[PDB]
Amino acid sequence: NKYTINDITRASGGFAMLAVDQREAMRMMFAAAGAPAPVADSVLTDFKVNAAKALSPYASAILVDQQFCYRQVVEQNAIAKSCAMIVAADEFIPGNGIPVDSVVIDRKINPLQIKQDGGKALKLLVLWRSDEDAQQRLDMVKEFNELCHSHGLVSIIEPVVRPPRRGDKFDREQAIIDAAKELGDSGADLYKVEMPLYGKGPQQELLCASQRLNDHINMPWVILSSGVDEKLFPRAVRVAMTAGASGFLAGRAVWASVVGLPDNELMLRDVCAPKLQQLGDIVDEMMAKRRLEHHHH
Amino acid sequence: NKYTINDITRASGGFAMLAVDQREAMRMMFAAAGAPAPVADSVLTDFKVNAAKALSPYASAILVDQQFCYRQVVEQNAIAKSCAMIVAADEFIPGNGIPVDSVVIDRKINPLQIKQDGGKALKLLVLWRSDEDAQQRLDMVKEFNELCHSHGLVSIIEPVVRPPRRGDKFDREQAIIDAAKELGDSGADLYKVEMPLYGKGPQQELLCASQRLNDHINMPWVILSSGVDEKLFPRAVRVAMTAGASGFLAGRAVWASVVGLPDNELMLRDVCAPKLQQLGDIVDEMMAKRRLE
Amino acid sequence: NKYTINDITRASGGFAMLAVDQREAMRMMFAAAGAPAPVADSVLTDFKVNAAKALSPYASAILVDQQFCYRQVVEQNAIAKSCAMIVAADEFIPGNGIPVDSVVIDRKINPLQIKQDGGKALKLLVLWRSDEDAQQRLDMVKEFNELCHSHGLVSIIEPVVRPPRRGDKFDREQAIIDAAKELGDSGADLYKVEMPLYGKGPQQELLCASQRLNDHINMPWVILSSGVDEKLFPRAVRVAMTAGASGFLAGRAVWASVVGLPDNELMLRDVCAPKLQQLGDIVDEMMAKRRLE
Amino acid sequence: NKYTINDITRASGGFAMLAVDQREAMRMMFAAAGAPAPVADSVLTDFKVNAAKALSPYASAILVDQQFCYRQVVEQNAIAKSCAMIVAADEFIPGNGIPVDSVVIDRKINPLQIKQDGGKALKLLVLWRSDEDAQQRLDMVKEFNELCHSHGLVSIIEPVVRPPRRGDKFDREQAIIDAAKELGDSGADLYKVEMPLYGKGPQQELLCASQRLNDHINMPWVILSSGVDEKLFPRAVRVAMTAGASGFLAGRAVWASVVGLPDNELMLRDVCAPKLQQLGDIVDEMMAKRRLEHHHH
C-alpha cells in the first residue's frame, strides 16, 4: 500500500492542510497569553486534541506531533475520516535562547506504527542558513525521503530560512529563493515554503515574488501561514496559487487568536473553523480556474 | 404596504443584521489605522458600499446612513434582494471631545423616499444617562415609533448607556438593566441592547446576566457587537439567544479588522464574510433549538 | 501679614513649584500601574507626604490638597522651611466618566487655618470651554481673588482648556490663547498655563507660540507640566521663560514615573529629585539672563 | 608611565563611568526610535561626541569606540580633563540575527596611540556560555591583560552571560555567578558585571544576590546598567555597593531615553546629565560609608 499526494488533497486536487504539531513554541504562546506558569504538557495536549476534533472536518490533512498529541488523537478518533493524518518526523533542538535552533530526523518516530494507525505522510522541517553546509541538508532530505517511501508514506519537506551563524548579511526574500534552488528538486513529494514578503504590500509585487519562487520548485508546493497576519493569509493563498502553488498549510493563522480564551471547544468551532473553511473554498476556486487554464494548453 | 419584523429576519425567524451606518467614529478608525489625514468622506462611502456589496448576501438586514452611503447603496443596487435595508434616523451631536455626545431624530431623513426605495425599517440610537430625564427619552421613542408606523416601516431602538453628566456613580451592568426597565416596553418592534460584561468571563455568569436583561425587555431583542471582542461575539450570540434574544446586530466585530488593509473588496470577502456567515449559522441553530422546546 | 509672589519664589525671583494636590486622577494612576484595587486613600496620603519630605527641599513652593494630605504634611512638618505651602481651593466635580468635569471654589477650605499654619497662597483650577459663559468664570476668579487677598494670601489661577459641551470645533492651541485673552488680566497674582504644542517639535515654533501667549497674560505666569513628556519639560521651561514666563509648576513630569515602584522614599530621592533640581537650575539661569537684558 | 584604577575613579575612590561605545546596537536603537533608514554612521558619531561633551564633566571615566567616535572625541577635545578616556578593545561579530553573537580582541586597536592620546584603560566584553570552552575565554582575558599592562593601561573585563549554543537549560542568575567563579580572579584590574535580577523586586533579595556575587569576584567590580530600568539603576548601585561593588558603568540608563528627541545637545544636558550626577553622588555617599565601616575593622 503506497500513498501519493492524492491521499492528502481535497476532492479538487488542492491542499488544505492544518498544522497543530507545534511544541515548546506553543507552550511559550500559552505563557505569553497569561496561562498560569509553568504551563503543563496537558494544556498543549488538550488544545491539540480539541483543535483536531473541531477543525479536521474542514482540512484535507492535519499535521500532529508524537511529543504532545499523536497517541491521544489516534486513540480518541479525533481526526475526521475525510482528513489524512500527517506525523512530524523532526526533532527540534533548542539553542541560543530559542526552542528550534537546529533540527534532525526524530529517531523515536515509528513509521510502521504510523502506517498501521492510518497515517499517510511524514513532514520534516529543514532549517536553511547560507553559511551551513548544503550537502548535510540534502543528505538529511534524501534519508527522510527513503524512510517515507520505504513505508509507502508521502514525504513532505519544510525549508525555513534563518540568518547565518556568523555575519549580518541576510536578505530573507533571497534566502527563500536560494533554499528553493537547493531543495526544490530534492525528491520529496511536497514542498512547504514561507510566503514572500510575509504576504504584505501590493498584490502585483506579491505575485511577481511568488512566480520567481515557482520557477525554482520542481514538485507540488504549498505556502505556510508562518509570519503572515491571519488577515493577509487568504490573499497570500490566492496569489501563491496564481503563481503555481497547490494550496496551504495553516497553523497560528487558524488557531493562534483563541489561545487562552475560555470555552476552548466553542472558540475553535466559532472563530477558527470559519477561517479554515474559507481557505478550503479559496483552494477549490483556484484549482477550478487552473483546470480552465491547463485546458487552454 | 405595512412591513413587520418578519421582513428583516432570516427564514428561521432569527435576526442576522449588519451595521455599516457609523459616521465620524468610522472616520476616526481610518485615521488611527494610518490612512492619510484628513480622511476624505469618499474613503467612508467606498468602504460602506464595498461592505454592502460583499456582506449583504449573508445578512437578513443591513443598517446604512444618509450622511455617507444611502444614495450610493440604493443607486448601485449594492444590497442583495435577500437583505432588507434599514436606514438610520438618528442625528449624532458631538461634544466633550467625542463624536456622539447627544442624539436627536434626524429631520433630514425622508421616510416616504426610503419606503419608495424598498427600505423596511428605521433605527434610532437612544443615549441613556441616570441623571438625564427618562420622560424626554420616552417622548423621543414615541415620536420615532409613530414616524415609522405611519409609513409602514419597522421601528428599531438602540439604547446605549453612558456615565452621568454629573457624579462618578456608574455601574455599566446596572445601567443596561435600568435602560431596559425604562425602554423595554416603549412600543418599538425591536430592541438592540449592549452585551452584559462585554461578553467576557465564565459562560454561566454571562447567561445569568443575559436572563436578567430578558426579564426587562417585552419586545424581540438582539445584542450589539459594540465593546465585545470579535472573538467573543459568537459565544455572546449563543448565550444571549439561550436567554431569549432573537439574534444580533454586528458592526466592528465583522468589518473593523480590515480597515486600512489593501485590496478592500478581497478582505471583505475573505476575512469579514466568514465571520458574518458563522453568526448567521449560530442564529439558525438557536432558533431551531427554540422551536423544539 | 500680607504675602506677595516674592514669598513663593527662589532667591533668583523665579518660580520652581511642585504640585502633589492630584485627587481621583492620582488614584486612577495607582490602579493603572497595578496597585491592588480598590486603591485605599492612605496609598495617596503616603505618596503625597513622602513626595513633600523628599522634594520640598528643591521647590520654592509645594501645592497640596485638603482631601488627602494637608493635615499630614502640616502635622509631620513634611515641608522644608525654604518651601512655601500653597493649598488647593478647588472642588473637582466628576462627570461624563472623568474625575474633573467641572470645578467650583471648595467651601470646606479654611483660609484662616491655612494662614495660621504658615500657608502663603491658594490655587484655583478654572476649566475653560468656548461655549460656557465667560462671565461665570470671571465671577468665580474675582470671588477667589477676594478670598485670598482678604487673608493676605497670594491668589494663583490655573485655566485648563477643554472641548466644548456641544460641537466638535476645538483647536487646543487657539483655546489656550482665548483663555489667556479672557483671564490673563483677571486680578490674580500668578497665572499657570498649559504649554503650547505639548512642548513638542522645532524650538522656533514652540518659542513663537509661547510669545503669542505672553502677549495675552498681564501678570507673572508659569507653565504647567500637564501633557508635556517629562523629557521635553526642561526645554519647555527654557522656551516659555525666553518668551516671558517666570518658571514652572511640575506634577507628573517630576513624580509620575515612580508610581508603583518599590522603595517609594528611595525612588523619590534618586529619580524624582534630580529632575526637580534641574528645573530649578534652569529657572535660576533664565532669570539671571533676564536681569542682564 | 603605568596607570592604576586610581586614574579612572572619582576623588572618593569610587567608579562613576559612562559607556558610549555601542555600535550596530546603537544604530538599531536610532532606527526603532523612527530615525530615517538606513541610519548613517554620522548620526552615531554626532550622538557619541555630543554625549561626551555634555556628560564627561560628570563621569570619572568615559568608554568610547574606534568605529564611530574615537578620532572625533580626541581631536575635538570632547572629554573633560577630570574624566579618563577608556577605549573598547573588543571586535563584535554578528550572527544568528544579532549584532554581537561572538567577540574577539580588536586587532585594529593601537594601544601606543591610545597611550600617547592620554587614554588610561582598555575594556573587553567576554560573552559567557555554559557550553563554550572556559579555557578559550581565560586565554583571551590573559592576552588582553598583557596587551594593557605592557603599555601601562588599566585592564577592564565585562563578562556578559548568554544562553547555551545547544539546549534550553539557562538560569541567568546562576550564569552570572558561574562567570564570576571562572573570571573573577583572571588578573584584570576591574570587573564589570550585570546586575542580579535586573535590579527588580524587594531590596533584601537584591542585596543577598549581590553578596553571593561579591564572594566570587577577587578584584574591584562595578555593575553595568544593561537590562536595568533607568528608574531602578540608582537603587541597584546602592545595593551592589552595600554588597562590595565600587561603583557603576552606565550606558542606556543615562542616554537611551533622548535617542531621536530634537535638540540633542539640550536633551543630553537637561535629561541625561541629572541622572549621571545622581549616580556619582550615590557612589560618593557609599564610599564615605565604607570608610566608616573599614575603620570599624
Q: Searching chain D, which residue's CA lies closest to the CA of residue C201?
A: D262
And the C-alpha cell for A130?
547560507
Q: What is the DSSP string of A91-123?
A: EEEEETTEEEEEEEE-TT--HHHHHHTT--EEE
Q: What angle do CA C11, C13, C15 make, to 5 degrees?
A: 100
Interface test with C, best of D198, D200, D235 (most C CBs within 10 A): D235
Interface test with B, best of C27, C28, C92, C96 (most B CBs within 10 A): C96
Kindly determine whether residue C231 and residue D267, on different chains, have CB atoms separated by under 8 Å.
yes
Please state, as a whole number, how many other Cβ atoms lie within 10 Å of the Cβ of residue D116: 9
| Of the partner residues D99, D102, D167, the one whose CB lies closest to the CB of residue A95 | D167
Kindly determine whether residue B97 and residue C167, on different chains, have CB atoms separated by under 8 Å.
no
Rounded CA-CA distance A142/A137 in Å is 9
Q: Searching chain B, which residue's CA lies closest to the CA of residue C98?
A: B168
Rounded CA-CA distance C161/D19 in Å is 44
Q: Residue A104 forms beta bridges with which residues?
A: A91
Rounded CA-CA distance C154/C6 in Å is 10
CA of B203 vs chain A CAs: smallest distance (Å): 8
In whole angstroms, what separates CA C96 from the centre of its chain? 24
Is D266 near chain C, with CB under 8 Å? yes
Could you give phi then psi for residue A141, rounded to 5 degrees?
Answer: -60, -50
DSSP state of C251: S
HSE on the CB side for A89, CA within 13 Å? 29
| Of the partner residues B94, B96, B99, the one whose CB lies closest to the CB of residue C96 | B96
Could you give phi then psi for residue A171, rounded to 5 degrees?
Answer: -110, 105
Chains A and C are in contact, defined as 3 or more C-beta pairs closer than 8 angstroms: no
Q: Searching chain B, which residue's CA lies closest to the CA of residue C129?
A: B96
Residues 229-248 of C with CB under 8 A from D: 231-232, 234-235, 238
HEC letters along D153-193: CEEEEEEEECCCCCCCCCCHHHHHHHHHHHHCCCCCCEEEE
Q: What angle do CA C27, C33, C38 make, to 5 degrees?
A: 45
In terms of DSSP bridges, do strands B98-105 and B90-95 run parallel, antiparallel, or are they unpaired? antiparallel
Please state, as a whole number, how many other Cβ atoms lie within 10 Å of the Cβ of residue A35: 15
Q: Residue C93 forms beta bridges with which residues?
A: C102
Could you give phi then psi for residue D215, rounded to 5 degrees?
Answer: -60, -20
Taking the alpha carbons at both ends of chain A, their separation in whole angstroms is 34
Kindly determine whether residue D165 and residue A102, on different chains, have CB atoms separated by under 8 Å.
no
Q: Searching chain A, which residue's CA lies closest to the CA of residue D97?
A: A163
Is A261 near chain B, with CB under 8 Å? yes
Is A165 near chain D, with CB under 8 Å? yes
Kindly determine whether residue C168 and residue B96, on different chains, have CB atoms separated by under 8 Å.
no
Instruction: Please name the chains neighbouring B, where neighbouring means 3+ C-beta pairs under 8 angstroms.
Output: A, C
Rounded CA-CA distance C168/A45 in Å is 54
In whole angstroms, what separates CA D61 from the centre of its chain? 10
Contacts of A38 in chain D (CB under 8 A): none
Interface test with B, best of A235, A248, A277 (most B CBs within 10 A): A235
Alpha helices by DSSP H, D35-191: 41-55, 70-75, 111-116, 134-150, 172-183
Only one residue has cell 443596487, namely: B77
CA of C96 vs chain B CAs: smallest distance (Å): 5
Kindly determine whether residue D263 and residue C231, on different chains, have CB atoms separated by under 8 Å.
no
Residue environment code for D240-255, b if the CB has 16+ CB neighbours within 10 A, otherwise e: bbbbebbbbbbbbbbb
Is B38 near chain C, with CB under 8 Å? no
Q: Searching chain D, which residue's CA lies closest to the CA of residue C281?
A: D270
Q: How many CB pairs under 8 A join B and C?
A: 43
Active site residue D192: yes
Residue environment code for D190-205, b if the CB has 16+ CB neighbours within 10 A, otherwise e: bbbbbbbbbbbeeeee
Please state, as a whole number, how many other Cβ atoms lie within 10 Å of the Cβ of residue A295: 7
Provide the residue type at A45 as one letter. Answer: T
Kindly determine whether residue D278 and residue C274, on different chains, have CB atoms separated by under 8 Å.
yes
Rounded CA-CA distance C54/C76 in Å is 13
Contacts of C262 in chain D (CB under 8 A): 201-203
Chains C and B are in contact, defined as 3 or more C-beta pairs closer than 8 angstroms: yes
CA of D239 vs chain A CAs: smallest distance (Å): 29
Is D165 near chain A, with CB under 8 Å? yes
HSE on the CB side for B187, CA within 13 Å? 13
Instruction: Please name the chains neighbouring D, where neighbouring means 3+ C-beta pairs under 8 angstroms.
Output: A, C
The resolution in angstroms reads: 2.0
Is A99 near chain D, with CB under 8 Å? yes
Contacts of C268 in chain D (CB under 8 A): none
Q: What's the sign of the alpha-carbon dihedral C180, C186, C191, C192?
A: negative
Contacts of D95 in chain A (CB under 8 A): 163-168
Kindly determine whether residue D263 and residue C234, on different chains, have CB atoms separated by under 8 Å.
no
Which residue out of A192, A200, A231, A275 is catalytically annotated? A192
Q: What is the DSSP string of C173-206?
A: HHHHHHHHHHHTTSS-SEEEEPPGGGG-S-HHHH
What separation in angstroms does the CA of B159 have from each of B47, B188, B223, D249, D284? 26, 12, 11, 60, 65
Residue environment code for A91-123, b if the CB has 16+ CB neighbours within 10 A, otherwise e: bbebbbebbbbbbeebeebebeebbeeebbbbb
Is A97 near chain D, with CB under 8 Å? yes
Q: What is the DSSP string of A218-275?
A: -S-EEEE-TTS-TTTHHHHHHHHHHTT--EEEESHHHHGGGTT-SSHHHHIIIIIHHH
CA of A61 vs chain D CAs: smallest distance (Å): 31
Kindly determine whether residue A168 and residue D96, on different chains, have CB atoms separated by under 8 Å.
no
Q: What angle do CA C134, C137, C140 make, to 5 degrees?
A: 150
Which residue, among C188, C192, C206, has the nearest Cα to C246 in the 3D structure?
Answer: C192
Residues 130-149 of D with CB under 8 A from C: none
Q: What's the sign of the alpha-carbon dihedral D239, D244, D250, D254?
A: positive
Interface test with D, best of C198, C229, C267, C271 (most D CBs within 10 A): C271
Which residue, among C148, C108, C150, C105, has the nearest Cα to C125 in the 3D structure?
Answer: C105
Which residue out of C48, C120, C123, C192 is catalytically annotated? C192
Kindly determine whether residue D270 and residue C262, on different chains, have CB atoms separated by under 8 Å.
no
What separation in angstroms does the CA of A38 have from each of A43, B277, C216? 11, 38, 62
C240: helix, strand or coil: helix
Helix (H) or strand (E) holding A179: helix A172-183
Kindly determine whether residue C94 and residue B165, on different chains, have CB atoms separated by under 8 Å.
no
Only one residue has cell 556575587, namely: D213
Is C167 near chain B, with CB under 8 Å? yes
Domain map (residue ranges) of chain D: 1-297
Who contacts D238 (Cβ-Cβ below 8 Å, separation ≥6)?
C266, C270, D282, D286
Kindly determine whether residue C163 and residue B97, on different chains, have CB atoms separated by under 8 Å.
yes
| Of the partner residues A24, A96, A167, the one whose CB lies closest to the CB of residue D94 | A167
And the C-alpha cell for A188?
520529496
Only one residue has cell 458574518, namely: B276
Is A95 near chain D, with CB under 8 Å? yes
B17: helix, strand or coil: strand
Who contacts C249 (Cβ-Cβ below 8 Å, separation ≥6)?
C15, C17, C18, C19, C63, C158, C192, C222, C223, C224, C225
And the C-alpha cell for B184?
423595554
In whole angstroms, what separates CA B255 from the centre of its chain? 13
